[PDB]
Amino acid sequence: PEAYVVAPGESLELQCMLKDAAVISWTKDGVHLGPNNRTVLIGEYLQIKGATPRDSGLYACTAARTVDSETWIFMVNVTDA
Amino acid sequence: PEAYVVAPGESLELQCMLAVISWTKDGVHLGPNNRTVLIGEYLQIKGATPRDSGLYACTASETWIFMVNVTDA
User: Fold this and answer.
1) B23: part of which helix (H) or strand (E)?
2) Topology at the third CATH level for domain A1-81
3) Chain A CB within 8 Å of residue B67 CB
4) Fewer CB within 10 Å, N side or C side of chain A?
């Protein structure tokens, strides 16, 4: 679990992994993340523009396929510090 | 984020911490089934297969998180 500092207003960008036939699902603090006006999920990428401090949290992407289900975690701290 | 490694075939058991507990895996809400039992603060899934791995999380505000790794390693 690696740390990511994002300055408020900037873009949080996370990248999961490349596995053939694996569809990527994202969580923040265990809760599900999907697409919205500030959230885009594409390929193995997660983008959130307009970082605010409550965007801070423990993000994780799980690449699941039928055979297996591998997982990466990112600790995101959105701060002016 | 707590680590839990289980060997395939064995029983995956999670125990929540610090109220009625609801479990998610990779964001999806879990209920009981023929290999899953949810009781008290416990989550049990028997017959672990590598696809049972994922990011589990238990909540009642407060939330506790588990990275489950099912491997023979």
Assistant:
1) strand B22-25
2) Immunoglobulin-like (2.60.40)
3) yes
4) C
